[PDB]
Design a protein around this ligand. Sequence first.
Ligand SMILES: CC(C)=CCN1c2cc(C)c(C)cc2N(C[C@H](O)[C@H](O)[C@H](O)COP(=O)(O)O)c2[nH]c(=O)[nH]c(=O)c21
Ligand SMILES: CC(C)=CCN1c2cc(C)c(C)cc2N(C[C@H](O)[C@H](O)[C@H](O)COP(=O)(O)O)c2[nH]c(=O)[nH]c(=O)c21
Ligand SMILES: CC(C)=CCN1c2cc(C)c(C)cc2N(C[C@H](O)[C@H](O)[C@H](O)COP(=O)(O)O)c2[nH]c(=O)[nH]c(=O)c21
Ligand SMILES: CC(C)=CCN1c2cc(C)c(C)cc2N(C[C@H](O)[C@H](O)[C@H](O)COP(=O)(O)O)c2[nH]c(=O)[nH]c(=O)c21
Ligand SMILES: CC(C)=CCN1c2cc(C)c(C)cc2N(C[C@H](O)[C@H](O)[C@H](O)COP(=O)(O)O)c2[nH]c(=O)[nH]c(=O)c21
Ligand SMILES: CC(C)=CCN1c2cc(C)c(C)cc2N(C[C@H](O)[C@H](O)[C@H](O)COP(=O)(O)O)c2[nH]c(=O)[nH]c(=O)c21
Ligand SMILES: CC(C)=CCN1c2cc(C)c(C)cc2N(C[C@H](O)[C@H](O)[C@H](O)COP(=O)(O)O)c2[nH]c(=O)[nH]c(=O)c21
Ligand SMILES: CC(C)=CCN1c2cc(C)c(C)cc2N(C[C@H](O)[C@H](O)[C@H](O)COP(=O)(O)O)c2[nH]c(=O)[nH]c(=O)c21
Ligand code: NA
Ligand code: NA
Ligand code: NA
Ligand code: NA
Ligand code: NA
Ligand code: NA
Ligand code: NA
Ligand code: NA
Lengths: 207, 207, 207, 207, 207, 207, 207, 207
Amino acid sequence: SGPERITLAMTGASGAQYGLRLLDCLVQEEREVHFLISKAAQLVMATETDVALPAKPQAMQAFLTEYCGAAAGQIRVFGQNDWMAPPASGSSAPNAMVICPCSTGTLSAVATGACNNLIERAADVALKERRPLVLVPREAPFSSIHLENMLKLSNLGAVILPAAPGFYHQPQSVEDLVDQVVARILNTLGIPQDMLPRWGEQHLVSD
Amino acid sequence: SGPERITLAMTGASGAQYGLRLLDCLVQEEREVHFLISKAAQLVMATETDVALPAKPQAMQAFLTEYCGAAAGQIRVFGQNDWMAPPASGSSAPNAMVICPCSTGTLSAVATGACNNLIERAADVALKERRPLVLVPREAPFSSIHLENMLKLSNLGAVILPAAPGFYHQPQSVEDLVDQVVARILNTLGIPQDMLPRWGEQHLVSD
Amino acid sequence: SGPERITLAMTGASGAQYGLRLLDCLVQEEREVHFLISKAAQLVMATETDVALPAKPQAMQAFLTEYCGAAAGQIRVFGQNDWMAPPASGSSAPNAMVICPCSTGTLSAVATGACNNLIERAADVALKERRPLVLVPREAPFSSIHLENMLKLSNLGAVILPAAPGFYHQPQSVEDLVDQVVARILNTLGIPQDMLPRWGEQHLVSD
Amino acid sequence: SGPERITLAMTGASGAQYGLRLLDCLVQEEREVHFLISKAAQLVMATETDVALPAKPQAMQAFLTEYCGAAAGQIRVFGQNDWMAPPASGSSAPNAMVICPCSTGTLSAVATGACNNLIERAADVALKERRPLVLVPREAPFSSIHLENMLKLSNLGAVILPAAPGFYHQPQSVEDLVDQVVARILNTLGIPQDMLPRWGEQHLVSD
Amino acid sequence: SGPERITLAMTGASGAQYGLRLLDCLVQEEREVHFLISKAAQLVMATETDVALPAKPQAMQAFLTEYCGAAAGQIRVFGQNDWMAPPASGSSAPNAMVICPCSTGTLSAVATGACNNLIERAADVALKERRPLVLVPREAPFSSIHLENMLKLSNLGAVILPAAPGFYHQPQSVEDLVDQVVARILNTLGIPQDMLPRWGEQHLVSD
Amino acid sequence: SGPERITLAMTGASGAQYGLRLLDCLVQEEREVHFLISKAAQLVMATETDVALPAKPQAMQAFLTEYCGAAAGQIRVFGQNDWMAPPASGSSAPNAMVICPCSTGTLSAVATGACNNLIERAADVALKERRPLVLVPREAPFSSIHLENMLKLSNLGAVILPAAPGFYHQPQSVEDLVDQVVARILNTLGIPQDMLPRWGEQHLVSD
Amino acid sequence: SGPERITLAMTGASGAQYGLRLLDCLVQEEREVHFLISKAAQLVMATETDVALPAKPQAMQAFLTEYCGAAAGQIRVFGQNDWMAPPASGSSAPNAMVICPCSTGTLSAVATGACNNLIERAADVALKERRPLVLVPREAPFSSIHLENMLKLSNLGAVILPAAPGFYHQPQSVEDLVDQVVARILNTLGIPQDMLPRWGEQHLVSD
Amino acid sequence: SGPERITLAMTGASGAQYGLRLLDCLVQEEREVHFLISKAAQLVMATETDVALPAKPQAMQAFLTEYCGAAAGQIRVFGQNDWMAPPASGSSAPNAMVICPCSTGTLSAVATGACNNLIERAADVALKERRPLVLVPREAPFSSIHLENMLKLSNLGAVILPAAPGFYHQPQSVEDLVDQVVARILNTLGIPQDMLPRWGEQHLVSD
Ligand SMILES: CC(C)=CCN1c2cc(C)c(C)cc2N(C[C@H](O)[C@H](O)[C@H](O)COP(=O)(O)O)c2[nH]c(=O)[nH]c(=O)c21
Ligand SMILES: CC(C)=CCN1c2cc(C)c(C)cc2N(C[C@H](O)[C@H](O)[C@H](O)COP(=O)(O)O)c2[nH]c(=O)[nH]c(=O)c21
Ligand SMILES: CC(C)=CCN1c2cc(C)c(C)cc2N(C[C@H](O)[C@H](O)[C@H](O)COP(=O)(O)O)c2[nH]c(=O)[nH]c(=O)c21
Ligand SMILES: CC(C)=CCN1c2cc(C)c(C)cc2N(C[C@H](O)[C@H](O)[C@H](O)COP(=O)(O)O)c2[nH]c(=O)[nH]c(=O)c21
Ligand SMILES: CC(C)=CCN1c2cc(C)c(C)cc2N(C[C@H](O)[C@H](O)[C@H](O)COP(=O)(O)O)c2[nH]c(=O)[nH]c(=O)c21
Ligand SMILES: CC(C)=CCN1c2cc(C)c(C)cc2N(C[C@H](O)[C@H](O)[C@H](O)COP(=O)(O)O)c2[nH]c(=O)[nH]c(=O)c21
Ligand SMILES: CC(C)=CCN1c2cc(C)c(C)cc2N(C[C@H](O)[C@H](O)[C@H](O)COP(=O)(O)O)c2[nH]c(=O)[nH]c(=O)c21
Ligand SMILES: CC(C)=CCN1c2cc(C)c(C)cc2N(C[C@H](O)[C@H](O)[C@H](O)COP(=O)(O)O)c2[nH]c(=O)[nH]c(=O)c21
Ligand code: NA
Ligand code: NA
Ligand code: NA
Ligand code: NA
Ligand code: NA
Ligand code: NA
Ligand code: NA
Ligand code: NA
């Protein structure tokens, strides 16, 4: 259940841990992942984590496959101008797409149709083909520029899913908070997850 | 520096820890706090924390004063229909106002001018007097209804500051994440804080 | 086929018979129903029908289970402030939601995001999770305020399904008219119904 | 009291019984009726009723006069391209106009100013002369296209009165439901009716 | 996979070959087709092709069945005012709908809700029932009137799929170009096709 | 007749054959062409054609001059950041400008004023000087993002001329289809062409 | 009085003399300046002035410090992708920001939220933190694209201060004109200047 | 080439030198000029220049004819309420119109259609007849009120040409700057000028 193939793009907002945890969960659910990452996101990851991600796609693909315990060819990695990759055309096989984290600059690019690199074109294709598109911005405050871009995209059917974890299961660790956002993304995609219980599911009637 | 008096309202989004930490920081900066809390927020706090907050304003005021180490009368607590309280009129002395957490229902009330209780009227007054108003929503996804309400209010000069902590100082605890959002709120108000360093302040020139 | 679980909310427009007939059909299709009812809707039902609906959720649940011939736990009843019930969070298991009848006040609440009670929050969650939301208003005239609220919600993907039965199968009773609207709701949800034939299904070619 | 002359147009939505009952009530209130009917409405009437309405205006006029017990010349019937009829020019004597039923296609024509036949031109004239215009759509769901057209026209002063009968007088027959809508139309026009009591008129003070 | 039943309407833009090729592919995928054609489209077909399409629905149905090699009753043909045909009511069994070619006049009719014939009403029903609607305009330049109509409909969930074939598989014939557009339509509907490969499907990693 | 100088920019939509055929026709009409091409368009041309276009402007200029049979200096080629070229300033001599093919990313850049390279700045100058600007997008579906960008630009006086060839002269080859679009572009510019007859020019009166 | 720290960005509009004169005045008022310059602005400066500005940030910093007579570390220079610099995060110490000259491309980037380099991100941060942002465009004509971008940003609280010097103090040199614009910028920031007298300050009453 | 007759209006923004230089260039190109000047512009000219312009139209006409070396009747001067002058009616012979300088008050009048004097009516006529209208505002900052007025007028086809001279030919005098704006106005009108070279005209290919 849910999509067999997910385009996962990481862009340069803070929150690299969310994208890595989501990649890991997707691999554990036996999904094929087309993995894309922006130059600024590579710097975020080097800044915020101890993951030493190689820069070139083939080396990055090898690295992420070992990091996640993925099967061979389960993770594809495509470079930022590789227009021969599936996500660049709506004639590709259907994927769901998630941008996590989603920088304000990528939010803006997708909202205006800029298509300046493969991540932006891929989201542009997702919208024109009416395939799932989930954006996970991380910023604060949100300015009116951010909010108008999110509103436009939500009105066009994108899911605006900010990295704003809930506290209602009493988190005990940073990892608990990361998992709550990742679980919400998986819920949105329709992919099984067991990190976030189904609210009130045992609640039969009011007190 | 910054406002001497802050109206701090807690409403029923998840994230009770943010409001309590902000209250604590405000008290430690010797600010007067006019504290307001919705019925649903009281349930969130009971659900997500071990804080046993008394229900009536006078008992709540005593409790919070001990919880924070506040001076006598530094924290005022007002009930949800107490139109005699300062926040209800623009002829009151100037306060900054923060709604943290800010539920989607309170976001909506403030965006449409509903003024159904003291928290909503207080924000309505803040906007009409052009006094600071900081809203800290916690929700995911944000629907187009949420986003249009945030956009309207941001366009009118409110600060939309979602509970979306950054990871770029490598948080080690839930408390580190809570402090990053609280530090941003204090920055927005112009109140000193030492939990979040000033980005790049020692960076003199590019490599 | 169609959703296993339906949140059915009744609010205070005239047309209590539509909600009761829909509840009955849903139970006969072996669906789980999370049943919600507003204080004004309780008065409509007492005014327009001979159904003596108990006021408290547990007694109401017992009553409706016998009224419909439902299996045990097939109908859940939740009170108007019970934020622990599944419909209040998008992390709940997926439901479709129907508000039938839908008062103009509830139409307005859902259109602005007011979330003042469980019915309003539940619809707010349905919209943010992109789950089905069917509103059945009953009013006449529709003012521009009603129409702008319906238009906003329809543009966001809600189904505006007014209680305006068709006459093209020559109804013979009030019950025939009620069934035509209920059949349309079930069609919209994708749930089998045999009260309303499929138009023109035997029509092979034009005369 | 109310208008002496009513242009009553029937167009091809389901609900032929509403137009016929309204015509009958208007005749019983000694009003002059300029009766117009679309080709699709003629098919609806043949489908949904046992009224065998002749096709040509003069024969239709004779038929409706006997059907209603009208006085001679009280009902005028005009064909769909008869630009010499009063409703086609604002220099005609003042009429109120009702389109009942109002198809979605006629709703659209009137909203955009299409004026493709006498019914559409007549409504266009009603709007430009600021004479009463009451539209009785019957459709479900209402799409955003329907809703934007109704909203535009309501904003211009038309009355959008959907065929959505209320149940709050406990209807016992289809005829009771038809009369509730017809009574609302007559109320809107300011014409006496005794089918629908005046709500709460004997209610002096609250319990 | 994909819809069992497709309403295929041809209207009077140039590109008759696209509609005929799509009809053929749909028949080869064992789909039921409800075929509709406008008077102007009949003239386009006579102008641009050597297909001698009979004018009356029954003869047209016989002709198209032989032209495509369809099974008996697989292709239904309905006339332009046949309101008894399934596409005219949302209570019909669910179809996807394609207008190919889509003239600018039909684009306009569907955008404003004109419902002047069965093709227009059928698309109006598709939108109100939230069933698939794919419009294939062929015009150049697109004026702002065309573009505002397409934008409105795309915002309401219609797919605007212009007859603008791609060249990236190096077409060798007019037929290759026609197949690229038809393949895109089938992709949009979710119907198998083998004329257009899935872009980059064998591309594992960037060079 | 028509402009003496045309800025022809090729960007990375499919349809490289259209730009090359247009360049050829312009040269055969003795027009001066300022030729610009994006990095992605160079990849399209290598993918979709057997034209081996050199990468550097001077070599590209030599190549295109031989390819077209142009006179010396009739084709100028400018690099993507060459702000000293005429198209970059409105104080240049007047040109008409055509972007053919026009990618969705360039459509977006021109619609928002991005001016990130010489093609984008050149179109920005064309709009501010009210000089002709013809955009030839090739995409399908057009999303609402594409359509809003085209609509904005058409409202500002740009010509949106999609690569959507007509079939009403019964094309026999891919080349016939390419020529129909190129002929429309030349018509739009006011430049003589003999590939597309003038519709109905010998038609004196209706049958 | 006025801000202690100013982010001064130069982008590629004509008017390099304005940015250099402003930098000089800021240094003479003992302000800290975080200096940013785009690649196109470097070409403008080389074209329009005899200032030989080194390309790398450290050499540029040394050069500008001598050019202005600045104290050590008073001018910081940051490269176009240096996300570790203060202006890139709202958690930095508060600055006012001026883009002078402001190209139409940078105007567009800031209006849409593109954040493609440090100048664009810095302005995006200024807007989200509600810190001063002054844009000094230099273009003529202003197209509707330019004007809509300026209007959006002015509505969000940016100051649109075009390089349009006044003549009402009878300028005698180009330098007089440059100083009038620079004086207006300093006035806007609240920084003392003595180049532009205060209009009418000695005017006590009308003649 | 270009218009034979120009309506040149001067209104009370700073920049009187621009209008006088433009008048002079127009006279040297043997154009007929219908010269209009507002009361506030007369005060600007007295303030900013040593031109002693007589107040009454006939004396002003004599003066300007000698100032420019104009032929007899080449410059017509019309008073501010002279509705018998050509510019007041669209039935006059075609002129291009320039308002230089254009005060913010005149910008506003023309944007709203105020027509309070001959300059405002003349621009209103230019817009309704679709004749050239060039506005040369001089103000800084531009407020959102200024920007919305300029945007409206630019969208209606007026040219918004702010007095914002470029520096890219290294001006040496105030006069050089004035000539750059005047040259742009003449370019916009299509009138020969030799003060501003054609950018890049000798640039054949990129380096
Ligand atoms: C401490 C800073 C600079 C703030 C947190 N953060 C962030 C952290 C780090 C450590 C780096 C380096 C960069 C950021 N940014 C800025 C962002 O990368 C820029 O807008 C950039 O152009 C994005 O481009 P892409 O869309 O990825 O192609 C960024 N952008 C954003 O939208 N949200 C963020 O949290 C942050
Ligand atoms: C697990 C649930 C139900 C989700 C997380 N969450 C939350 C947790 C708990 C534990 C409770 C009880 C309630 C919420 N809600 C719902 C919210 O309180 C309602 O909209 C309510 O009417 C708000 O009214 P006020 O504006 O405070 O007057 C709420 N609202 C919101 O905007 N964000 C939230 O995170 C949550
Ligand atoms: C004869 C009357 C008062 C009209 C028919 N009708 C109705 C019947 C009865 C018998 C009662 C008592 C109330 C109504 N109302 C009014 C409605 O309940 C109010 O707006 C109310 O606040 C709704 O709140 P909720 O959204 O349910 O929380 C209501 N509202 C509405 O939208 N449509 C209706 O038909 C009617
Ligand atoms: C079972 C069907 C097809 C649905 C109910 N219904 C209806 C019943 C019958 C039995 C017929 C024949 C037709 C309808 N229609 C379609 C409607 O007539 C078309 O839009 C038509 O062009 C209208 O043109 P006019 O505006 O009258 O000129 C129609 N239109 C509408 O707006 N509401 C309706 O209820 C229905
Ligand atoms: C060479 C002409 C006239 C242009 C190409 N073309 C076309 C070819 C032929 C050969 C015919 C006869 C007609 C067209 N038209 C005009 C179109 O049919 C009219 O708008 C007409 O009212 C459409 O009504 P419908 O929506 O079908 O009911 C039309 N309309 C359109 O939108 N795109 C087209 O390509 C063309
Ligand atoms: C099979 C693909 C990927 C689809 C057809 N096609 C295309 C073919 C080929 C073979 C390549 C390589 C690229 C495309 N693209 C994508 C496009 O180049 C990107 O948006 C790109 O950033 C454009 O940048 P520029 O505006 O030129 O600077 C593109 N873009 C577009 O708008 N229309 C197209 O047809 C296609
Ligand atoms: C004579 C020309 C080309 C006109 C005056 N001028 C200018 C002069 C020179 C000498 C150069 C080289 C460039 C310009 N430009 C074009 C501008 O740099 C481009 O839009 C460019 O992408 C800007 O990118 P950035 O925003 O700086 O990153 C530019 N842009 C602008 O907005 N205003 C200007 O005056 C001019
Ligand atoms: C130093 C001042 C007052 C600023 C520069 N300047 C100017 C200089 C002088 C010396 C005078 C006297 C007046 C101005 N004004 C104000 C302007 O004339 C008023 O809005 C006035 O009503 C205009 O009416 P009109 O449209 O001409 O009928 C004006 N208006 C404007 O739009 N731009 C300007 O530069 C200036
Ligand atoms: Na681009
Ligand atoms: Na209230
Ligand atoms: Na509330
Ligand atoms: Na007509
Ligand atoms: Na019609
Ligand atoms: Na740029
Ligand atoms: Na970017
Ligand atoms: Na006046």
